[PDB]
């Protein structure tokens with residue numbers, strides 16, 4: 401599923417991401433834009449041989465099982481394929497664990513490089529939430 405911007409903002413807010421670990425809704429929407437372009441089916445291979453899955457490009461190195469990432473963990477206890485669903489529940493549940501791991505949203509290199517310190521409220525502008 402390719403989410404619309406306000407459509408994803410609503411879904412994230414319903415699933416309690418708005419101000420989760422102190423990160424406002426616009427931070428999450430911004431991260432999703434630059435990680436996946438709001439596409440739940442987005443996959444990208446990393447240089448280390450792990451893969452990033454779904455709207456928030458969650459990494460098989462630590463967070464989900466894809467069966468092809470040697471010496472990797474599955475800390476969200478989910479198949480990485482579950483992170484590609486039209487229903488973002490799994491991605492949001494897993495993202496809550498990631499952002500709690502100690503470095504906040506710096507875990508998402510695209511958030512640090514493209515969203516951090518920017519006017520992230522622009523990403524929820526005009527949305528009925």
Ligand code: NA
Nearest residue numbers: 460464472473
């Ligand atoms: Na894994």
